[PDB]
Design a protein around this motif. Structure first.
Motif, PDB file in Angstrom:
ATOM      1  N   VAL A  56       0.825  -1.203   0.000  1.00 39.92           N
ATOM      2  CA  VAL A  56       0.000   0.000   0.000  1.00 39.92           C
ATOM      3  C   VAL A  56       0.862   1.256   0.000  1.00 39.92           C
ATOM      4  O   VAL A  56       0.824   2.048  -0.941  1.00 39.92           O
ATOM      5  N   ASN A  57       1.641   1.435   1.063  1.00 41.75           N
ATOM      6  CA  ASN A  57       2.513   2.598   1.186  1.00 41.75           C
ATOM      7  C   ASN A  57       3.931   2.262   0.734  1.00 41.75           C
ATOM      8  O   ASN A  57       4.784   1.905   1.547  1.00 41.75           O
ATOM      9  N   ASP A  58       4.176   2.382  -0.566  1.00 47.01           N
ATOM     10  CA  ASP A  58       5.491   2.094  -1.126  1.00 47.01           C
ATOM     11  C   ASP A  58       5.624   2.678  -2.529  1.00 47.01           C
ATOM     12  O   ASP A  58       4.747   2.499  -3.375  1.00 47.01           O
ATOM     13  N   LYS A  59       6.726   3.380  -2.770  1.00 48.50           N
ATOM     14  CA  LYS A  59       6.975   3.992  -4.070  1.00 48.50           C
ATOM     15  C   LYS A  59       7.406   2.944  -5.091  1.00 48.50           C
ATOM     16  O   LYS A  59       6.869   2.882  -6.198  1.00 48.50           O
ATOM     17  N   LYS A  60       8.376   2.120  -4.712  1.00 49.15           N
ATOM     18  CA  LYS A  60       8.878   1.071  -5.593  1.00 49.15           C
ATOM     19  C   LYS A  60       8.833  -0.288  -4.901  1.00 49.15           C
ATOM     20  O   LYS A  60       9.366  -0.455  -3.805  1.00 49.15           O
ATOM     21  N   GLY A  61       8.197  -1.257  -5.551  1.00 47.92           N
ATOM     22  CA  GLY A  61       8.096  -2.591  -4.984  1.00 47.92           C
ATOM     23  C   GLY A  61       9.449  -3.165  -4.614  1.00 47.92           C
ATOM     24  O   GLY A  61      10.482  -2.720  -5.117  1.00 47.92           O
ATOM     25  N   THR A  62       9.447  -4.157  -3.728  1.00 43.37           N
ATOM     26  CA  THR A  62      10.682  -4.792  -3.288  1.00 43.37           C
ATOM     27  C   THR A  62      10.698  -6.273  -3.646  1.00 43.37           C
ATOM     28  O   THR A  62       9.715  -6.984  -3.434  1.00 43.37           O
ATOM     29  N   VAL A  63      11.819  -6.733  -4.194  1.00 37.94           N
ATOM     30  CA  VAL A  63      11.962  -8.131  -4.582  1.00 37.94           C
ATOM     31  C   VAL A  63      12.319  -9.000  -3.381  1.00 37.94           C
ATOM     32  O   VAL A  63      13.311  -8.755  -2.694  1.00 37.94           O
ATOM     33  N   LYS A  64      11.504 -10.019  -3.134  1.00 36.46           N
ATOM     34  CA  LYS A  64      11.732 -10.930  -2.017  1.00 36.46           C
ATOM     35  C   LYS A  64      12.447 -12.194  -2.484  1.00 36.46           C
ATOM     36  O   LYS A  64      12.336 -12.589  -3.645  1.00 36.46           O
ATOM     37  N   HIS A  65      13.177 -12.827  -1.571  1.00 36.89           N
ATOM     38  CA  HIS A  65      13.907 -14.048  -1.888  1.00 36.89           C
ATOM     39  C   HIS A  65      13.749 -15.080  -0.776  1.00 36.89           C
ATOM     40  O   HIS A  65      14.228 -14.881   0.342  1.00 36.89           O
ATOM     41  N   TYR A  66      13.074 -16.182  -1.088  1.00 40.29           N
ATOM     42  CA  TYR A  66      12.850 -17.242  -0.114  1.00 40.29           C
ATOM     43  C   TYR A  66      13.800 -18.412  -0.354  1.00 40.29           C
ATOM     44  O   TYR A  66      14.258 -18.635  -1.475  1.00 40.29           O
ATOM     45  N   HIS A  67      14.091 -19.156   0.708  1.00 44.00           N
ATOM     46  CA  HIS A  67      14.986 -20.305   0.614  1.00 44.00           C
ATOM     47  C   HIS A  67      14.251 -21.596   0.963  1.00 44.00           C
ATOM     48  O   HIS A  67      13.331 -21.597   1.782  1.00 44.00           O
ATOM     49  N   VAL A  68      14.663 -22.693   0.336  1.00 47.54           N
ATOM     50  CA  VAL A  68      14.045 -23.991   0.582  1.00 47.54           C
ATOM     51  C   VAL A  68      14.943 -24.875   1.440  1.00 47.54           C
ATOM     52  O   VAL A  68      15.921 -25.445   0.953  1.00 47.54           O
TER      53      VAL A  68
END
Length: 110
Positions: A56-68
């Motif tokens: 909602v409150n964000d200018k530029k999205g952020t890339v997330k990184h999950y681990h298995v």
């Protein structure tokens, strides 16, 4: 179908060996908030599931990184307190509907 064996490249989401710089560009160019992807982990075994998203409150999205993480019984899972059949056998679940703190995959990205 039955087209393909133990082949990850088959699927689309599975991007494979990709540079942290690429995964982003490819995840951004798409222009689809929610797009996800799966790349190989530094060391043969684990898997890094990265996906783009916005808030909602964000200018530029952020890339997330999950681990298995791998369990004693060679069990694969992206979220703690959860176990799946395999990498490609897991997405089928999340994709259709999230599970825990794992964003709801909107669409696969290479």
């Amino acid at each position: 179908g039955s087209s393909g064996s133990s082949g990850l490249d088959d699927y689309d989401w599975f991007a494979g060996n990709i540079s942290r710089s690429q995964s982003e560009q490819l995840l951004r160019q798409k222009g689809k908030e929610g797009a996800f992807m799966v790349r190989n982990s530094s060391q043969v075994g684990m898997y890094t599931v990265s996906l783009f998203s916005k808030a909602v409150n964000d200018k530029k999205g952020t890339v997330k990184h999950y681990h298995v993480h791998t369990n004693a019984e060679n069990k694969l899972y992206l979220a703690e307190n959860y176990c799946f059949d395999s990498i490609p056998k897991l997405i089928h679940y999340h994709q259709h509907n999230s599970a825990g703190m794992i964003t709801r995959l909107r669409h696969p990205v290479s």
